Amino acid sequence: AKSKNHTNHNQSSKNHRNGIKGPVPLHLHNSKRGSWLPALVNARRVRKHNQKAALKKRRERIAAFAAK
Amino acid sequence: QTKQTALVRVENVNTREDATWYVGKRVCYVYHGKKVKRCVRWSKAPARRSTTRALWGRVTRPHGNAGMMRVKFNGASVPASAIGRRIRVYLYPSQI
């Protein structure tokens, strides 16, 4: 026998029971994979240099603190 | 119906202002049983022993605009066999 085909009667109520959650903020999950490659490669070189600078900065802080 | 409040119609009381005069007065319903039981002054006044019995109450507030009154009885409620029968309304406690 025939039956109901389709309806959207109760769906809005179901979606709002646990609410419609907002988006993740922009500073999270901001991966750069798939972007324009030439700019991606150049940015990798700068980040490698910055890590070496960070290590050097900590050593100087330790030596200065020990000297009081 | 709500059985813990009773409605009483009094002769010559036909307005709401008339019914206000009787708020707080004592009310009695008199009937008889089948056997002689204990009463007030059972031993002091043996002449009172009888099958006659009474239930007491008080007037609480008026009812409607025509002089009907609401009555509350001490403890239990008045029996349904008293519908359409005589009720006594005394003049005490007196405010005059």
């Binding site: 029971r17 646990n18 993740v24 999950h29 991966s31 994979r33 798939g34 330790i62 603190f65 | -």
Partner: protein
């Protein structure tokens, strides 16, 4: 009536008592509930909550990790001050990958025999919480630590391994069975390794 639709969804599930059957755990809970109620330090309150927590949420810690974090704190501490006491609400286990350690004072619910031997041989002391309550009633000059929870096999198994961007392990006893279709491009299709979120 009052319109309080969806008000039960703001209730939170928190444990108020322990499920443990250990009388010594019960004694410690009694002592630190008293301290948390009657003092003004956050250390006692945190210790009381962690004592209430369950075994799976009290992951053990490594002696090498303790040593590393203690050194990283000590490099920026004046030489006229004493090193803090490491405090773990859980178990401390030995580490064969690190042989040389400094003298440390550690308080924990339980020590393995190897860890106790290593600490004593290095020249430290192993303390219990009743001793700690007398040495530092308010938790002054301490270092609260937790063990690692990620890296457990159950955590590695959580999730569906057939959706794009997922790298969870499937529940299977035969390692070589669930290859081919759905995991290789040559067999119909391959699950995508990456997906933007």
């Amino acid at each position: 009536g009052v319109d309080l639709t969806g008000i039960s969804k703001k209730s939170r599930v928190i444990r108020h008592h322990t499920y443990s059957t250990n009388p010594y755990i019960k004694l410690l809970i009694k002592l630190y509930k008293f301290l948390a109620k009657r003092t003004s330090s956050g250390f006692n309150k945190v210790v009381y909550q962690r004592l209430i927590k369950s075994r799976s949420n009290r992951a053990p810690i490594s002696l090498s990790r303790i040593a590393v974090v203690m050194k990283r704190k000590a490099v920026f501490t004046a030489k006229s001050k004493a090193a803090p006491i490491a405090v773990v609400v859980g178990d401390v286990l030995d580490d064969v990958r690190m042989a040389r350690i400094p003298a440390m004072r550690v308080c924990a619910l339980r020590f393995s025999k190897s860890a106790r031997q290593s600490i004593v041989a290095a020249g430290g002391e192993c303390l219990t919480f009743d001793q700690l309550a007398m040495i530092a009633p308010t938790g002054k000059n301490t270092y609260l630590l937790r063990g690692r929870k990620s890296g457990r096999e159950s955590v590695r198994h959580f999730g569906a391994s057939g959706v794009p961007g997922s790298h969870s392990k499937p529940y299977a006893t035969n390692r070589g069975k669930e290859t081919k279709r759905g995991r290789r491009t040559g067999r119909s299709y391959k699950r995508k390794a990456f997906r933007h979120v």
